[PDB]
């Protein structure tokens, strides 16, 4: 839903989607050959499949291809300054790809805008959709556009013929959030086969031991997961598959 959305935000009005309560296979993203950029800070994609988080945020928008340089810690320039800022201790991944064939139009596409003027730089993950006329000079522009009085947002003009640095790029930023709460997002967990009738070392759903596993005559209630005897040793288990 994030990566194959039909239309993306303008960068000044960047979307945010919150991900929680699901299994996240980052390596299925990373192995997809699509991406012009896939860059991670504080993590590596293969290790992300081993981690767990309270939420993940996916932020997304379109920018011009040469501006992608600015979507990083410590960067500056109109995108980093006035449109979208990462914190300088960002922990997350930036993904981008060329979308020229979706987002350019033969008559030029002007649906996508960016913030050209602002009083001051954004704070990290701040957003600013305000359309108040920017006073560049001394006159209170009073919601009228003129000599020192500018509309603060400007369109890109994506023609399909643009040079590659001037083509549209779709961008997604993933931020990983760990709080004092249950970690609702995790990488997938691998199962081996069963091996009955041999001495094996086992891990059923976090319950571990060594023993010989064989089909039982006894039957649990539907919510029960393992059996114990009168001595409180584990005498039986339910296969989670």
């Amino acid at each position, epitope marked *: 839903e994030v990566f194959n959305a039909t239309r993306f935000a303008s960068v000044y009005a960047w979307n945010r989607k919150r991900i929680s309560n699901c299994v996240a296979d980052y390596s299925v993203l990373y192995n997809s050959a699509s991406f012009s950029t896939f860059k991670c800070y504080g993590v590596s994609p293969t290790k992300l499949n081993d981690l767990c988080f309270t939420n993940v945020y996916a932020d997304s928008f379109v920018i011009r291809g040469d501006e992608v340089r600015q979507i990083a810690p410590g960067q500056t320039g109109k995108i980093a300054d006035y449109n979208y800022k990462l914190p300088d201790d960002f922990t997350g991944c930036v993904i981008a790809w060329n979308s020229n064939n979706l987002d350019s139009k033969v*008559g*030029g596409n*002007y649906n996508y805008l960016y913030r*050209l003027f602002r009083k001051s730089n954004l704070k990290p993950f701040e957003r600013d959709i305000s*359309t*108040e*006329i920017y006073q560049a000079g001394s006159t209170p522009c*009073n*919601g*009228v*556009e*003129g*000599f020192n009085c*500018y*509309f603060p*947002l*400007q*369109s890109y*003009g994506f023609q399909p013929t643009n040079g590659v640095g001037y083509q549209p790029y779709r961008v997604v930023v993933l931020s990983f959030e760990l709080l004092h709460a249950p970690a609702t997002v995790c990488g997938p967990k691998k199962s081996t086969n069963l091996v009955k009738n041999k001495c094996v070392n086992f891990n059923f759903n976090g319950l571990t031991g060594t023993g010989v596993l064989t089909e039982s005559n006894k039957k649990f209630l539907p919510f029960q997961q393992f059996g114990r005897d009168i001595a409180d040793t584990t005498d039986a288990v339910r296969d989670p598959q």
Partner: antibody
Amino acid sequence: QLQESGGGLVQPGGSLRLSCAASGFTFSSYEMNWVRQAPGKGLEWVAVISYDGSNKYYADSVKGRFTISRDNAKNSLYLQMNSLRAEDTAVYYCARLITMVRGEDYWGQGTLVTVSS
Amino acid sequence: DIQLTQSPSSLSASVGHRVTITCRASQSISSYLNWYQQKPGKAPKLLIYAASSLQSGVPSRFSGSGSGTDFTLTISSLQPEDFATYYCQQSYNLPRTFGGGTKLEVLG
């Protein structure tokens, strides 16, 4: 897309109400203008209103007599016309005039008014 | 107030002619001088969104120029739809104001 409406034929000293529906763009973001054109004359600026509607301005012919007003919730501009004059005999255009910053201009098809007994 | 002065009030030309019209403001306005084409009573087509800045989707044969009081619209080679009126309008301050539009009225 812009569509002016409410134009007509009216006596001197009368009143009339123009309207202009906006479609296919974020009307709510922009200064929106009235311009007019008397038959065979050049373009004449009538008035403008801020994006939020907070401020209004006029040319000296229509000043005090008329009012420019907007309903962003309805994507609609208006011109209240009062104390009508031969001056007010024009096609009235509703428009996003661009000024220095790149963006997509819009003009409506214009609504006719004539002032005569 | 600022007032606008299209040096040709009218023109005659033929298809293929490189054409220029010029507009003088009554006072300096930096680069704040738009240009439009109008076919009679039709919605004025913005050509130039400043003295020089050519608008989105406007044909490449059009161009603007100028500074202070003096400005140009040019048509690199005239074509049949260009037998039309042209308006300068100043974008500098209120009241927004238009030139006496140059009518390229002589179709051939």
